[PDB]
Design an enzyme around this catalytic site. Structure first.
Site, PDB file in Angstrom:
ATOM      1  N   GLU A 107       0.718  -1.260   0.224  1.00 60.38           N
ATOM      2  CA  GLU A 107      -0.009   0.105   0.092  1.00 60.38           C
ATOM      3  C   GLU A 107       0.819   1.223  -0.005  1.00 60.38           C
ATOM      4  OE1 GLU A 107      -2.062   0.936   4.005  1.00 60.38           O
ATOM      5  OE2 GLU A 107      -0.463  -0.353   4.820  1.00 60.38           O
ATOM      6  N   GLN A 108       0.289   2.287  -0.462  1.00 63.07           N
ATOM      7  CA  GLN A 108       0.827   3.610  -0.644  1.00 63.07           C
ATOM      8  C   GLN A 108       1.753   4.095   0.513  1.00 63.07           C
ATOM      9  OE1 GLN A 108      -1.545   7.004  -1.653  1.00 63.07           O
ATOM     10  NE2 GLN A 108      -1.637   6.240  -3.911  1.00 63.07           N
TER      11      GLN A 108
END
Ligand code: NA
Ligand code: NA
Lengths: 528, 528
Positions: B131-132
């Protein structure tokens, strides 16, 4: 006043055409009269030109909010005051929820409305400040520059420099990103770009030396400012080039003006600009969203009281005038793959401009050479010079080859005495050499009069002088037409004189049997 | 089973370690037993390895959700079933809300937990699906590859290929983006990358030929798929290079699996892959989030019933085995600015690897040359060859010069008869040449005995052989000490015999006066 442009550094500041905006941290930004804006903001951008009502059509316009307590005439007058002080007032095209979605053809009407608005209000130019969806919506990427060229030209006819600026969010400035066409089409037309280095959270860049540098990392703001600008002004690290004399660094005025990006310690900026200067590339200024936020209050109703312009005003204005980067540009160059023996023309699609956007494609030269007759890699270099500068760019041309393909070479069974043609349903093809069916040879034969397995090797000869070759194999089984005794089953029960086929022979049971394999019951057993 | 890796194309599918996920369009994704996953998914990625509780420390782990109704032993057994069918099961590291924030030093413990988990469950490898925030959080960019090298090596010792894959979101794959270090450090270690070409909305790329191509544009999906892959597999258009034999195209299974990205018409994909093949660069597969979504229901409770694997399964598996791109790599090369007369070493910071990540920096060669003794531009080219391929990259070296600066040359007033030293408080400096104060000459003199304006020109000679020069000027005003009659004021009232200074003279009023300029009242007027 008349068209007032800036030749020295700028401190740009945006001006809300609305009252009482809410801050990212609960604070408040009142509307302010233009005349109250600190003199050190020498570019003030009226925010925003946009579509007010789709029922008026597609062309965006500007309508002053009357609650700012400025009549139309008084607004024009405060613009005039700024101009007489030598300061510029731009119309900022875009902003949030602008409903700008232009079609091809709209460039004429847009230009006309831009000029209309500039003549009525006395604007000195236009900042392209498109929101996300709008950067790429419909034909915006074509209409907005086309119109802006016509506008720059209209006012050049009467000796005026109508200014053009843009405020892209920084992650859009990669070599092949969404802002490409605005920057390349308006190349030579625009006066400076003021990107927004804020609101992008953890976005940033990787510096092969020191690692990942995020726009929201307050421990490394100096390194953010420096490497992102260095990258832009040299067109390195995957950024489109924006010459230093045309780069203005956009910031939030304070923590209420933006979600992320605010510089906690100004020293970080001073030091980054100072380093850029030291490498002979001083920048053109700083920009901020916004004068209202610089004049607003935080959420405890304490006044920001001009902290941004206190931090950066004197710093930016006390610098030398900008020194123009006159390097020309090359466009259209991309490493390319070509099929062996295709025609390759090294100039097609490649263009060049000088630093004021004149076309100088004719002056482009190319060194290195491609042989499309030999698979492999060939490096070309393009170069172009003008105004005593030169630019070069390489281009890889790789020549490659595709294998032909056979069809119809699958194993098949045929009945005794049939006619069999090794080539019926058989072909070969290649993408540039075409139908190679006549280039196929067959090794082996099939004897349809004799039961058995016949192996055929197909050869295809191809390419220059038919000196390349591929091979494939096929088995053709010639089976007997004649009916036979059923195959023996391990599970079946058999009676004296029952007969079965198994392992090529016909066997007759000598009595009752289950599960005994013919051939395995010796000289005197159940199967003979 | 043992470590099962894939040598041919893959259709990768993710497997939710949880039940009843909600779709972007109101639909539902039930948890499914591994054994129910369609055989055509030959890579199934268990989702997700993560930090479950910070109170267990920083190292992420895997814990099966018991409500999927699989005991630990039964889960291991279904993995074993997949393996005996020749299929791979990977542990996917990451996903949303993974709380993975690793510090330098953590690489040893992470590797050990990876191996522990792979030995217990029988995993065949690990997909990096950060994830980011996690791509760049703390030292993730260093710890995760360091640990993954150790893991790949552990299992190479016993003859196993532990697989490594990654699922970056495509906008992170620009040449200098956040995924850089994972891709370059794990170069030669990773088996293929499966980027997510979905959930990025209007993000996309610009093709100088046909314009802006957005990941959510269903009218141009074929062009999206083709140009984004072409760019990645050639490292063009500002993307980090991922060889075609290692590129798997990640998609949402249906509209409930992702906000954007789903392919409405499969033909678009078939045609894009077919074109890539035609240029001699067939891709390695397709990937999808997820098997559960491919097995879920839409919001009217109608069953998706395997539509994704129906669309792409046969297409991907019915293709030739992949053909390895063995081109080597160059790293560290960035156009660079150097100060005139600095030492420049062309090799420093530049490295190279072969296609399996062996270091071959020693084989790097450089053509072209830099003269740091002459301002200007110099093109170098780096090249390296290995396994009968070559890579080259240019590098611009620009040599530049910075002007020295004077200090202390400001206009000043001095009192009659003072001593004045044209050099007191005066210096010059340069960044590499240092204190140039001794190189300054003064033209003009000041006569402190005589009231008046004295103009001094300072010259600084510098650079090689002191053949460069700058100049500046200063005015020194020598003023009188002596007191005088006050200056006449236009507004003041004067009486007979009052005296004033004005325009260098002393004047005496002959009577009452206001506002008459001495010197202007002729032969017989008020001022004499
Ligand atoms: Na004006
Ligand atoms: Na396994």
């Amino acid at each position: 006043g008349t068209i007032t442009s800036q030749d020295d550094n700028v401190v740009v500041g945006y001006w809300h055409n609305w009252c009482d905006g809410r801050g990212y941290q609960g604070g408040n930004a009142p509307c302010v009269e233009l005349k109250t804006v600190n003199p050190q903001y020498n570019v003030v951008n009226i925010s925003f030109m946009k579509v007010y009502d789709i029922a008026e059509g597609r062309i965006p316009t500007f309508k002053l909010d009357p609650t700012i307590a400025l009549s139309e005439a008084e607004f024009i007058a405060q613009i005039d005051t700024l101009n007489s002080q030598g300061r510029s007032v731009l119309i900022a095209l875009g902003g949030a929820d602008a409903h700008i979605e232009l079609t091809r053809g709209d460039e004429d009407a847009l230009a006309a409305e831009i000029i209309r608005l500039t003549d009525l209000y006395g604007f000195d130019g236009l900042d392209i400040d498109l929101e996300q969806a709008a950067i790429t919506a419909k034909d915006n990427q074509f209409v907005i520059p086309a119109a802006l060229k016509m506008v720059k030209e209209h006012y050049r006819k009467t000796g005026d420099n109508f200014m053009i600026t843009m405020a892209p969010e920084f992650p859009y400035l990669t070599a092949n990103g969404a802002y490409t066409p605005y920057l390349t089409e308006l190349d030579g037309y625009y006066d400076f770009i003021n990107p927004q280095f804020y609101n992008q959270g953890g976005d940033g860049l990787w510096i092969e030396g020191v690692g990942w540098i995020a726009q929201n990392n307050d421990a490394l703001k100096e390194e953010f400012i420096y490497y992102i600008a260095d990258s832009l002004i040299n067109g390195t690290r995957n950024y489109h080039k924006i010459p230093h004399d045309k780069l203005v660094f956009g910031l939030p005025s304070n923590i209420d003006a933006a979600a992320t990006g605010y510089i906690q310690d100004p020293q970080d900026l001073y030091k980054a600009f100072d380093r850029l200067k030291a490498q002979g590339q001083p920048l053109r200024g700083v920009m901020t969203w916004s004068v209202n936020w610089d004049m607003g209050t935080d959420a405890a109703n304490n006044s920001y009281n001009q902290q941004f312009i206190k931090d950066y005003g004197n710093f930016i204005h006390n610098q030398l005038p900008p020194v123009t980067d006159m390097t020309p540009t090359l466009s259209g160059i991309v490493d390319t793959r070509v099929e062996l023996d295709s025609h390759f023309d090294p100039l097609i699609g490649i263009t060049a401009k000088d630093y004021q956007g004149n076309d100088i494609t004719a002056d482009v030269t190319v060194s290195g050479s491609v042989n499309t007759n030999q698979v492999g890699d060939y490096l070309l270099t393009y170069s172009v010079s003008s105004d005593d500068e030169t630019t070069n760019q390489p281009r890889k041309i790789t020549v490659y080859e595709i294998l032909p393909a056979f069809t119809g070479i699958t194993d098949t069974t045929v009945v005794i005495d049939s006619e069999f043609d090794p080539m019926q349903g058989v072909s070969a093809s290649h993408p540039t050499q075409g139908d190679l069916t006549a280039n196929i040879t067959v090794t082996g034969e099939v004897d349809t009069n004799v039961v058995g397995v016949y192996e055929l090797t197909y050869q295809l000869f191809y390419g220059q002088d038919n000196q390349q070759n591929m091979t494939d194999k096929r088995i053709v089984t010639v089976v007997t037409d004649a009916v036979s005794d059923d195959d023996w089953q391990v599970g079946s029960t058999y009676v004296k004189d029952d007969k079965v086929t198994h392992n090529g022979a016909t066997w007759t049971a000598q009595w009752w049997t289950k599960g005994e394999e013919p051939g395995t019951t010796g000289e005197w057993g159940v199967w003979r």
